[PDB]
Design a protein around this ligand. Sequence first.
Ligand SMILES: [Zn+2]
Ligand SMILES: [Zn+2]
Length: 426
Amino acid sequence: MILIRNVRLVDARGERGPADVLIGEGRILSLEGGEAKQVVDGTGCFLAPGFLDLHAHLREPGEEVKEDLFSGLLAAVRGGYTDLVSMPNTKPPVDTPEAVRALKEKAKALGLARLHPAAALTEKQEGKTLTPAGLLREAGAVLLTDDGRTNEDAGVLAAGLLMAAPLGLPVAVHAEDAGLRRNGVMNDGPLADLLGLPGNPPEAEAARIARDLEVLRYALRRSPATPRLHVQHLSTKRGLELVREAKRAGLPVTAEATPHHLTLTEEALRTFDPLFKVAPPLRGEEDREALLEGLLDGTLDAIATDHAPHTLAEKEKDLLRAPFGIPSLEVAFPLLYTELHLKRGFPLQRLVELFTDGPRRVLGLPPLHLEEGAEASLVLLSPKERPVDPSAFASKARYSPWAGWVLGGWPVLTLVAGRIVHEALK
Ligand SMILES: [Zn+2]
Ligand SMILES: [Zn+2]
């Protein structure tokens, strides 16, 4: 039982308060105060529903040295997440009910962020044979994806959507046409040529998204149930336009954007620093600007991390040999609260919506609002400014493309159904 006084309330519906929030019995008991032995002065802070990440690579099983559920779910709660979706590109890939159950059992024993695991669309994510979606859902899978991997065979993706539709399992795709991407290490264009690096055409992403939207129409026709397509990390202006028009046309497609594609651009590669090597690549300012507009108009349904950790040593190899990936679980919200809300005037309720309601709806889960009687899975954000300090990360990837960045909006308290899983009141 906890009482948070003089705090602002913020969920997708809007900003309210200051108010005194009484939490107990795992729920929000009152928004008009009450009595409690544990009292938190939330002056200047705002309370929001616990966040939910749709795209996190936790490196377990198989590559625990990079990350594992212990470090990953801890980093998650420190980042304000009370719910998280793990990707299946592990060693070996999560494509069986037992693998799904194992992850869920461990996440329950640890009792930090809620694990909602994703399973592969195809066995070993090799893109040839569909997995047993029915059994996977029964075990707890919330979405199917071969992510990491692209889906080159349109027939498999189509069949995948048909298998998933009646199960209510969204199919999330890493939309890049491998044929046109070739083995680009950064965004293709003038800068790539200036740096003498093989480019990955942003059109490679537009091409695959365009294809998939037509494949989705096929699923709509052939399936009795409504299929669900989710475009992962969307990074280009053209890709955004494609999704915007598909939505206008009424297609059941959703999309997410990552913290790095919203704050960084290809320009960051002028040093050949692998810390900025990611898939899909960082794009141009024009693309980044378009995404911000996409966040506002609703074309983008959620902000997902695509938390992809590796070891510092690996990230210290030559740019061409270094792995693709950026970690961000612990900095995602403060980063965007600072760069988008404070510096660009981006609406706070909309930003919070993108970390809550949006992600939950993508999965088909009911929204969690700050209202009396609601489950007390919340996060308290502080305006205090402090730099991103990798050495202090709970995540094992002790590095960051935003290292040193002075940000406000860091979580100082995270609760999962009333239980304190993270506290840094300061
Ligand atoms: Zn991906
Ligand atoms: Zn990914």
